[PDB]
Amino acid sequence: HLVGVCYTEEEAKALAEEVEVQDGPNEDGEMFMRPGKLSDYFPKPYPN
Amino acid sequence: TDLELHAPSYPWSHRGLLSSLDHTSIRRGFQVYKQVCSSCHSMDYVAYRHLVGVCYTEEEAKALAEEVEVQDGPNEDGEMFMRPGKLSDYFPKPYPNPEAARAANNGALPPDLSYIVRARHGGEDYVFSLLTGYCEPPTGVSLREGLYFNPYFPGQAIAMAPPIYNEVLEFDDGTPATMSQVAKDVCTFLRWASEPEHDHRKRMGLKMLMMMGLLLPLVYAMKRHKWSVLKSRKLAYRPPK
Amino acid sequence: DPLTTVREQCEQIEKCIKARERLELCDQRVSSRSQTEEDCTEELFDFLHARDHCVAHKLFNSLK
Amino acid sequence: TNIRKSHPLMKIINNAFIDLPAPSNISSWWNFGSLLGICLILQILTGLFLAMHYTSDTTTAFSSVTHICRDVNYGWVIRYLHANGASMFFICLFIHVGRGLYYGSYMFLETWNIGVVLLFTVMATAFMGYVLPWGQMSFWGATVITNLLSAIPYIGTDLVEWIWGGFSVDKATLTRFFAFHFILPFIITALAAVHLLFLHETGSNNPTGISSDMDKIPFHPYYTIKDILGALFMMLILLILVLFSPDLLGDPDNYTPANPLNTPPHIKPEWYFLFAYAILRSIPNKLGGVLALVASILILILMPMLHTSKQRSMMFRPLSQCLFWMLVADLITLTWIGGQPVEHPFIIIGQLASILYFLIILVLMPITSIIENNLLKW
Amino acid sequence: REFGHLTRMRHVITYSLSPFEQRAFPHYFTKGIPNVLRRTRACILRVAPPFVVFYLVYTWGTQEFEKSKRK
Amino acid sequence: LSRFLGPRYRELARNWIPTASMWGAVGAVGLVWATDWRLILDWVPYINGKF
Amino acid sequence: AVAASSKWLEGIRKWYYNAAGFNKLGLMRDDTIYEDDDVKEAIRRLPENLYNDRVFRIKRALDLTMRQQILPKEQWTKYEEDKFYLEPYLKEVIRERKEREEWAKK
Ligand code: HEC
Ligand code: HEM
Ligand code: HEM
Ligand SMILES: COC(=O)N(OC)c1ccccc1COc1ccn(-c2ccc(Cl)cc2)n1
């Protein structure tokens, strides 16, 4: 939702490819990490 | 080009119009699902709260889901804290890599079973007639390696290897565990699973037929009483001559 | 154990023997030459349909 | 000083149901008009329950319906009341139309034309209710409509994309099918009050086809007790199909979920659409097949214009009675053909029976009435 | 359309009996069984011959479907 | 059929066929903004009606 | 208008009169006509004795159909006794409608 208000769409994805949050699982593996996929809410600090 | 084979009619003990289900053959039939399969088939709609009253009281259902260990949710400073199952569960699921677990089964994934007799054109007569009907491949039929010739299958070569021999199992009360005592009990299972309203709609259908045997000949008597005025009337025409 | 003996006497019915014999009459027809894909799934369907009809009439007495 | 003749609201009810003049020789075929009003009310107080516990998306539709039969209390009885209650509506509708065709009731022109609108609206509603459970028959039956709906040469490709939620099979497909199914049963309830207001100008037809103004009886108590008895016999048949065989009218392959996973072993709708699916499938052109689908229902409007007999009904017309039952046997053939695969004997049969349905109404029926006119010396 | 404004009629007499003075079930199997046989005979040659031709086409259509998949 | 036969029937239909493009072309302009007919909004270069 | 089929085509007319069954309810042929606007003007022009005969014959036939019954066979309407009482009044009403229609286009 930041594109067109205060950023163009590049300058926008690079702020999402800066934080690392936990994605879901994948077979031949488990819970892995994949950063900002252009549509992601802002990360909370506390687990509970 | 080839034809297909349809399952015959077996005289089940619940086939009649007012016939209940046998509540001992579902108890013996849960364990033909519990520990002969669940290595290939989920039943993603039944829970252990659905087994109390039908065939268990709640203690024998509480003792199960402690033979299985599934992954529960999160905590603080632990991540995926786990437990054995509660009785409000779809207890495990089988194989990971969902919908592409066919690599374990050579390009053919076995489906879910919680609606499998409702989803076939044979009911529970189809599941019985395919589970106990394997044959050897006849002359000229070349088979891809991983196919087993089952004549009650539409493609005529299912990737199913046969899952039951004789005594893959032994019941709790003491019952011979032949290949036909097997697959008769799990086909009295998988039908209660598809239709858990089976014995309730046949007892309610009996009370309906006794009230309509009272309410209908009496409303027909009230109709016959009003209409007798018109049914008995006479007409005459007397013009001046 | 009751199925494998109920299925035995269901084959000597005259409706089941002439569904069996020209299943095996076509056995030496497929492995004879090389110019054929004459399969034997038609000949075996009439055997199993004639046989498994009478099995269902009798199997459930010997169970439960 | 009689309060049911002078109160402003009570005198509307008295003229409509109590003191209404009615023919005395009305048969049991005139019972099915109030039966259609019972089936429509029942499908409203049962569709209340299902839309309460419902979610319509491509990921959860097939499981939102299986939640009701097991988990939701009194949900197995109400779901199969709704699926068999719609089969009951369609058998009471085909009897009703065939009555008015046989006895010449289409000569009430304004009442007949609102009826043809009512036949289109319930047919389109029930199509958008079988797409909601999202099984194999829901998918492949909906995706043969849009092949003939994108065949509209100018506006069709943006028409189907506007009703599919926006692209294709997705989450929002079942937000426009579900919207077009919640609100269409209430246009039917308003079109039924207008339907009866036009019939009130003349009163009812009767099996002889002769006006009956010398032999009228009041509606109460003669046909109020006869319509209550006929409705009790309908509830007995409906509760037998619900409590003793709730899957007799249905398809098992719609319990297999929806996915473009694999092509199904067959494609077939419910029984009351099998005559229409058989006609469009026997036309090898997706524009000629969508024209003959609409021409199989809107052909009823030409029935006042095609009438050439000097009598009104078919009670005294023996040559026309033979043609009426040939038309009923032709619709039984199309219901059987429409559930068969597209193979050798079911293409020459399914396309000759599509021809004879139009040949009887347009050509054979107007010529035979003229032949019977000459035999009675008029 | 109200009851005293419908039509003109002269010289017609009707006689009726009270519902509490008569039997609700008169001759039922004495009159009714030969009456429903006269009505069945009068309509059997108009309704039935179309449904016989549906039966013959249905049997020829399912038998020539199976004598195509055989060999 | 002599149902609607006559020189009177197409005489009032002679003077109405000038204003019977109020039957067909009015339906053609009655479906410009009720429908968003896509390829006949470039009937004119004037309608850039949606952004 | 064929002289060779003078008796044969009268056999098909007598057969169709009995296959139709308004004579079993005691009705004449002009009792069974569909009443459009030209028929309703011809009924208004009937003399008073032919009007009252038609009203009673229709009421007696509606009462028989309510009971699902017919008349005894000696009371059925014969084929060569059926009087076309309405046909002279209806041919005159239609001729007057066709005169007002040639005038409106000429
Ligand atoms: C050897 C592994 C294996 C075992 C164990 C197994 N099956 Fe399967 N089954 C398969 C495979 C593989 C498929 C997938 C079918 C295909 O796509 O060819 C399948 C599919 C099915 C089907 C669907 C067949 C059809 O015609 O749609 C049924 C029914 C079924 N399994 C029942 C059972 C039952 C009941 C048991 C327990 C006695 C069982 N299976 C145990 C291998 C197995
Ligand atoms: C939701 C649908 C409908 C409802 C609720 C309905 C209701 C009724 C009712 C209550 C009557 C009077 C009683 C009777 O004669 O049965 C009637 C009569 C009639 N209906 Fe319908 N109807 C519906 C659909 C149709 C259709 C689809 C048609 C025709 C295409 C139609 C045409 C007629 C005609 C012509 C009559 C008068 C018949 C006569 O008096 O002989 N209706 N309707
Ligand atoms: C003329 C009246 C109606 C007809 C003919 C009709 C027809 C149908 C049909 C064919 C189904 C599919 C059932 C199945 O395939 O299992 C269905 C279910 C459904 N209907 Fe209706 N219906 C009517 C009224 C209504 C009303 C009044 C509502 C909403 C208030 C409604 C909303 C739904 C919903 C949400 C389903 C969900 C699927 C399910 O629960 O099975 N319908 N109806
Ligand atoms: C209960 O639903 C089904 O049977 N549906 O649709 C999900 C189905 C399912 C599978 C295959 C085909 C269909 C539909 O086949 C037809 C054939 C004709 N109509 C139709 C529809 C609306 C109108 Cl106005 C007029 C005609 N529909």
PDB file of C-alpha atoms in Angstrom, chain F residues 4-38:
ATOM      1  CA  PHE F   4     -53.199  -7.461 -40.400  1.00  0.00           C
ATOM      2  CA  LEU F   5     -53.685  -6.896 -44.127  1.00  0.00           C
ATOM      3  CA  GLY F   6     -54.305  -3.441 -45.517  1.00  0.00           C
ATOM      4  CA  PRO F   7     -52.848  -0.243 -46.947  1.00  0.00           C
ATOM      5  CA  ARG F   8     -53.637   1.428 -43.587  1.00  0.00           C
ATOM      6  CA  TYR F   9     -51.290  -0.793 -41.552  1.00  0.00           C
ATOM      7  CA  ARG F  10     -48.102   0.349 -43.306  1.00  0.00           C
ATOM      8  CA  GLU F  11     -49.278   3.949 -43.742  1.00  0.00           C
ATOM      9  CA  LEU F  12     -48.955   4.834 -40.061  1.00  0.00           C
ATOM     10  CA  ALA F  13     -45.857   2.598 -40.183  1.00  0.00           C
ATOM     11  CA  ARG F  14     -44.649   4.745 -43.100  1.00  0.00           C
ATOM     12  CA  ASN F  15     -44.580   7.954 -41.037  1.00  0.00           C
ATOM     13  CA  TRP F  16     -43.171   6.198 -37.952  1.00  0.00           C
ATOM     14  CA  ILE F  17     -40.124   4.548 -39.597  1.00  0.00           C
ATOM     15  CA  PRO F  18     -38.376   7.981 -39.471  1.00  0.00           C
ATOM     16  CA  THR F  19     -38.902   7.933 -35.672  1.00  0.00           C
ATOM     17  CA  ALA F  20     -38.440   4.159 -35.423  1.00  0.00           C
ATOM     18  CA  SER F  21     -34.715   4.672 -35.169  1.00  0.00           C
ATOM     19  CA  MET F  22     -35.962   5.848 -31.783  1.00  0.00           C
ATOM     20  CA  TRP F  23     -36.618   2.085 -31.396  1.00  0.00           C
ATOM     21  CA  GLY F  24     -33.271   0.660 -32.532  1.00  0.00           C
ATOM     22  CA  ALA F  25     -30.602   3.355 -32.303  1.00  0.00           C
ATOM     23  CA  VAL F  26     -32.002   4.422 -28.935  1.00  0.00           C
ATOM     24  CA  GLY F  27     -31.329   0.883 -27.784  1.00  0.00           C
ATOM     25  CA  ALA F  28     -27.884   1.310 -29.336  1.00  0.00           C
ATOM     26  CA  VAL F  29     -27.271   4.465 -27.277  1.00  0.00           C
ATOM     27  CA  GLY F  30     -29.171   2.941 -24.342  1.00  0.00           C
ATOM     28  CA  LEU F  31     -26.318   0.444 -23.956  1.00  0.00           C
ATOM     29  CA  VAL F  32     -23.295   2.762 -23.943  1.00  0.00           C
ATOM     30  CA  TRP F  33     -23.056   3.528 -20.207  1.00  0.00           C
ATOM     31  CA  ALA F  34     -25.334   0.787 -18.849  1.00  0.00           C
ATOM     32  CA  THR F  35     -22.946  -1.856 -20.218  1.00  0.00           C
ATOM     33  CA  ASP F  36     -19.479  -0.334 -20.843  1.00  0.00           C
ATOM     34  CA  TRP F  37     -19.398  -1.707 -24.371  1.00  0.00           C
ATOM     35  CA  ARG F  38     -15.625  -1.790 -24.749  1.00  0.00           C
TER      36      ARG F  38
END
